[PDB]
């Protein structure tokens, strides 16, 4: 399908200003939107966001409206202002994935056929990215339901357009990853890749609690994913592979050695050029 | 140096103020074998029109370059030992008429060990001049230095090659230059600044 | 059965666990790798044949606990390499 | 001549042959590197030990 | 220096030196600078590491280094019986410099760099020949000392006891090992702190 | 034809031509198996090139799935003799089709590349990208699960 | 750039007397621009000072959200085609750290101004040796460091 969705800044902001318009209520309750945009050589790009009614009760989700009309007549707005921007599907806040977002696909199913939903939290207080994109994929089985629907996941990531950029570094002007050599790399890969392990690896040991309580009865496919994960662990670190990362490990040395050498003679050359400077100064002075 | 840029001016020689012709082929062909590698010979100083040449009217030299290649080590050292005398009286070459000697035997020793793998030095001690001891001798110098990859067994009497990877000499060195340097720059920092 | 450390199974420690000769077991590595089921390289030298990756099965409810403990001693892993670069470089931060 | 890579074992006549790899390069730059900078604090110590 | 040099510490005993002779002034001085320099090459001597060559030939150390300077050519040598013969010809001068304590413990390194170059030049040597070559004098207590070098890491391969010969064993691939990476961190450190 | 195709198809040529020696007389037709086959001359070199290209496929599948075969036991399945199988085993390796060096010292050929320090190293690099990304995609399978009918 | 703005009324440009009232130093913080001084500005329309509004919620959910990776940390970057970049980079400082040389003696004469203008049209060692020196120690720590980093979170 679609290998990965970029998801603009405008289109984030416009669903946290949609939250709070709409959230007076305070306690708890999801927002549903229809997403525009455009994509090409199979990579989807959303730029723009209007909000579509959406109301359904909690219990016994299986009610839920949302306003074909004002999809379309809104659409007709959009269209005029910019005409590049079609329909690409559909947003909303919800943490969890709510169940009964598998039948709502359908019904955007019409305006896009391959429609994805993205899910984007308005109240993050988190580590990793708040954009999970989304798309419908169909096969039936014998095992879950007669009726197998199930969503695939693609990668998302946060876009940037020239224009959009520009406001978006100004209104930051907060804080900014200033001098983008190896503190950074350090601190925006490193660390953070490992927090991001963690938390994944605590996931997936959560779910694992069934072994005890069970919640599903094993859902195998699950079991059958993490068997190869360990099997896919990396082989022993006592072979030849010490060999082989010792004969690499130190052949970079090497080129840092050198690295830092050529830095401490033009270090030096500097000292020079400044002291012989006010030497030059003070001698004639005085 | 000195063989890269006698050999370009080998048919080249307007310069007979010092060091006539005659002579500049000896040089060339002195410091030639010591410089380059034998493929290089082959199409440098063997197969050079000008320079074989020449050595027709010079006996004594054209025995000493044909020797290494063609493998008469017995030839070679006779021809050395003369080469040795005569490097001493000659001046420019005397500071380091050791040096060569020393250094030819080893790029001899080279040459016999890199074919085979665990000749006897019985064996050497006849096709590489008389002596058992000598080459025993002189063959425990050399491999401590460092040069002359090969490792001798006594009781048995016989000497197997290795073959160390051009990484580790590569390595010994760029720390061995880099120290050299490194000292260097230390010295300077001391120097400025009292 | 076998703990990925090891999986070195030799030429005779296969015919007698299925009933075959010696001379024969070749066969069966192949035909077990030609389906796709097992993965792995034959060495007729030492005769040794090498797994790497057996298709995953079903495992009814002890195995799965097992399963936690092998992520119970990697999180708690990876968690000390963490917190041992946050450290280490807390001047190389925000 | 350098058209083989091995050697002949007399012992039993065989002819071993090996690999040798290339000079994997990248040492030689750092080599040659190291040497040039080497003249080049050369060429700083007369800017300042007869200068300053 | 001196103090650390004379209770065992040799190796900061070099550092410390180093450090002075580098921070000592260099125009003038030129009296302790003989003092210092003679100090150090004896403590590195009873180190190991081979002193460098060329404060063999400055000008104002040329005379004064000839004591220390033969001294060096029979401790590199493995041979014992050539620093016993310089020890007689020159011990006078090292009393007289207050330094001749250091040297007479000299007598274990002159087999320790013996014994690591003839196990690094030879694979399997007959226990007699050992004696001859490093003037032992005799070849029942060559064991022992062979057999002692061993323990402390001066040589590796292991002897046949029965059979009467030394073996060494095959030390090559040192790039793989971690070393190379230690020795490149020592540079590093400090080329990244001037 | 199927044979050329699944099972990887370890073949033996004694048991071709005695599954498949219509080919070479009758059958339901035959009529391009005369002409193929039946010849006297041009149909009979047609047959040593079956056999070279049954031979190829065992020597080269047989690659795949080793790492070291004596020479002795490669002789049998290619069914030629020791001296044969080094003779079309040469022609293969020096033209640059499958990759063999035979230490006929000890009759044990290897038919593995001296593996190189990046390459090991290298594929160490892909186990990883594929192991982070199996984790990410086995969380994501439990959020559609666990978090979904638990919620109901 | 924004400078949102208002128009003024004819009538008190007719009347003369000064619009806008000032009672505060809060509006005679900008400096107009001389470009928009040419047209009405101050004549026919008075600009209003212009600022924004930003709370966590939105600056979290946009600083931290724009230029992030999910897992590009532990990534060892093609490592065949690492050293290979290492070996471009230094042969390139092979024949810059030559020119340095050439740079330094030539350099400290006269006239340093006409030194300083005499870079204008070549490249200049000292700061190209510095930027690839940069990108080379950089790129191996990282490298290098992920190395270890890997080899104890997995097994």
Redesign the interface.
């Known amino acids: 399908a679609v290998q990965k969705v970029v998801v603009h800044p405008l289109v984030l902001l416009s669903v946290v200003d949609h939250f709070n318009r709409i959230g007076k209520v305070g306690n708890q309750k999801r927002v549903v939107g229809v997403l525009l945009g455009s994509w090409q050589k199979k990579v989807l790009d959303v730029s723009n966001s209007f909000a579509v009614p959406f109301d359904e009760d909690d219990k016994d989700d299986s009610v839920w409206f949302l306003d074909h009309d004002y999809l379309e007549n809104m659409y007709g707005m959009f269209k005029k202002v910019n005409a590049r921007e079609r329909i690409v599907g559909w947003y909303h806040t919800g943490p969890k994935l709510h169940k009964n977002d598998i039948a709502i696909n359908e019904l955007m199913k019409r305006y896009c056929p391959n429609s994805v939903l993205v899910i984007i939290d308005v109240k993050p207080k988190d580590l990793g990215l708040p954009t999970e994109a989304y798309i419908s994929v169909e096969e039936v089985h014998d095992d879950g339901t007669p009726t197998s629907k199930t969503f695939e996941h693609v990668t998302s990531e946060i876009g940037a357009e020239e224009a959009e950029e520009v406001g978006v570094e100004h209104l930051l002007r907060d804080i900014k990853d200033t001098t983008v050599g190896t503190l950074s790399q350090r601190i925006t890969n490193q660390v953070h890749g490992l927090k991001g392990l963690n938390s994944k690896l605590l996931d997936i040991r959560s779910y694992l609690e069934k072994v005890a309580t069970g919640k599903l009865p094993i859902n195998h496919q699950i079991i059958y994913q993490l068997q190869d994960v360990f099997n896919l662990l990396p082989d022993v670190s006592l072979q030849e592979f010490v060999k082989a990362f010792y004969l690499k490990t130190n052949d970079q040395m090497v080129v840092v050695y050198l690295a830092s050498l050529i830095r401490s003679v033009v270090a030096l050359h500097n000292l020079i050029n400044n002291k012989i400077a006010n030497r030059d100064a003070e001698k004639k002075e005085g | 140096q000195a063989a890269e840029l006698f050999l370009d001016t080998v048919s080249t020689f307007t310069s007979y103020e010092l060091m006539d012709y005659k002579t500049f082929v000896t040089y060339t062909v002195y410091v030639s074998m010591i410089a380059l590698?034998?493929?290089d010979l082959?199409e440098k100083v063997i197969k050079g029109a000008e320079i074989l040449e020449v050595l027709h009217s010079l006996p004594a030299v054209r025995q000493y370059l044909f020797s290494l290649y063609e493998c008469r080590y017995s030839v070679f050292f006779q021809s050395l030992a003369v080469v040795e005398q005569e490097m001493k009286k000659d001046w420019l070459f005397a500071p380091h008429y050791r040096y060569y000697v020393r250094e030819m035997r080893i790029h001899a020793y080279s040459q016999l060990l890199?074919?085979?793998?665990?000749?006897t030095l019985g064996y050497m001690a006849e096709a590489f001049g008389v002596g058992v001891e000598f080459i025993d001798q002189e063959?425990?110098?050399f491999?401590?230095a460092g040069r002359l990859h090969c490792?001798?067994?006594?009781?048995?009497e016989i000497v197997?090659?290795?073959?160390?990877?051009?990484?580790?000499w590569?390595?010994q060195?760029?720390?061995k230059?880099?120290?050299?340097?490194?000292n260097?720059?230390?010295?300077?920092?001391?120097?400025?600044?009292m | 059965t076998r703990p990925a450390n090891h999986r070195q199974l030799t030429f005779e420690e296969i015919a007698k666990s299925a009933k075959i000769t010696v001379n024969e077991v070749e066969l069966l590595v192949m035909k077990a790798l030609s389906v796709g089921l097992v993965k792995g390289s034959i060495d007729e030298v030492d005769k040794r044949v090498h797994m790497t990756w057996v298709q995953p099965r079903v495992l009814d409810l002890q195995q799965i606990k097992g399963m936690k403990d092998r992520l119970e001693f990697w999180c708690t892993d990876v968690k000390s390499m963490e917190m041992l670069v946050e450290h280490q470089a807390h001047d190389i931060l925000t | 001549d350098k058209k083989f890579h091995g050697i002949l074992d007399q012992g039993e006549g065989v002819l071993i042959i090996f690999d040798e790899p290339p000079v994997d390069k990248t040492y030689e730059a750092a080599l040659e590197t190291i040497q040039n900078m080497s003249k080049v604090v050369d060429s700083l110590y007369n800017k300042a030990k007869k200068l300053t | 220096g001196r103090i650390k040099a004379i209770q065992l510490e040799y190796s900061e005993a070099r550092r410390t030196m180093t450090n002075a002779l580098r921070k000592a002034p260099q125009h003038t001085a030129v009296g302790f600078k003989q003092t210092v320099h003679k100090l150090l090459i004896v403590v590195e001597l009873l180190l190991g590491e081979i002193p460098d060559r060329l404060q063999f030939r400055q000008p104002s150390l040329k005379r004064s280094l000839m004591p220390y300077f033969l001294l060096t050519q029979a401790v590199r040598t493995g041979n014992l019986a050539k620093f016993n013969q310089v020890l007689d010809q020159f011990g006078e001068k090292f009393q007289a410099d207050g330094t001749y304590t250091l040297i007479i413990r000299l007598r274990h390194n002159v087999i320790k760099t013996g014994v690591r170059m003839i196990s690094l030049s030879y694979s399997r040597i007959s226990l007699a020949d050992i004696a001859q070559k490093l003037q032992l004098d005799s070849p029942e207590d060559a064991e022992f000392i062979v057999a002692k070098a061993i323990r402390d890491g001066v040589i590796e391969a292991s002897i046949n006891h029965e059979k009467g010969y030394v073996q060494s064993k095959e030390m090559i691939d040192i790039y793989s090992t971690r070393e190379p990476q230690l020795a490149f961190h020592q540079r590093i450190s400090f080329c990244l702190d001037i | 034809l199927l044979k050329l195709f699944t099972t990887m198809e370890l073949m033996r040529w004694s048991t071709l031509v005695e599954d498949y020696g219509m080919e070479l007389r009758k059958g339901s037709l035959e009529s391009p198996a005369t002409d193929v086959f039946g010849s006297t001359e041009e149909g009979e070199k047609r047959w040593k090139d079956l056999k070279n290209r049954v031979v190829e496929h065992n020597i080269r599948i047989m690659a795949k799935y080793y790492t070291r075969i004596t020479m002795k036991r490669m002789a049998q399945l290619l069914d030629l003799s020791v001296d044969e199988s080094e003779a079309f085993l040469s022609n293969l390796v020096v033209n640059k089709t499958i990759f063999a060096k035979v230490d006929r010292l000890a009759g044990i050929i290897n038919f593995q590349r001296p593996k190189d320090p990046n390459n090991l190293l290298n594929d160490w690099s892909q186990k990883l990208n594929s192991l982070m990304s199996l984790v990410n995609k086995t969380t994501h399978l439990i959020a559609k699960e666990e978090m979904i009918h638990n919620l109901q | 750039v924004i400078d949102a703005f208002r128009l003024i009324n004819a009538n008190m440009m007719v009347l003369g007397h000064e619009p806008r009232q000032t009672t505060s130093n809060l509006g005679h913080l900008n400096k107009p621009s001389i470009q928009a001084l040419i047209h009405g500005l101050n004549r026919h329309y008075y600009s209003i000072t212009i600022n924004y509004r930003k709370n966590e919620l939105e600056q979290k959910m946009l600083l931290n959200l724009h230029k992030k990776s999910w897992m590009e940390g532990l990534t060892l970057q093609d490592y065949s085609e690492h050293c290979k970049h290492n070996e471009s980079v230094v042969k390139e400082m092979l024949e810059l750290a030559k020119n340095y040389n050439k740079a330094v003696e030539e350099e400290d004469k006269m006239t340093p101004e006409q030194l300083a203008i005499k870079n204008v049209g070549k490249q200049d060692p000292k700061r190209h040796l510095e930027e690839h020196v940069d990108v080379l120690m950089t790129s191996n720590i990282v490298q290098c460091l992920a190395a270890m980093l890997d080899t104890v979170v997995f097994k």
């Open positions: 590698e034998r493929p082959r890199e074919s085979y793998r665990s000749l063959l425990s110098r491999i401590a490792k001798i067994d006594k009781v048995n197997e090659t290795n073959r160390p990877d051009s990484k580790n590569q390595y060195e760029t720390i230059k880099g120290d050299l340097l490194l260097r720059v230390q010295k300077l920092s001391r120097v400025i600044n």
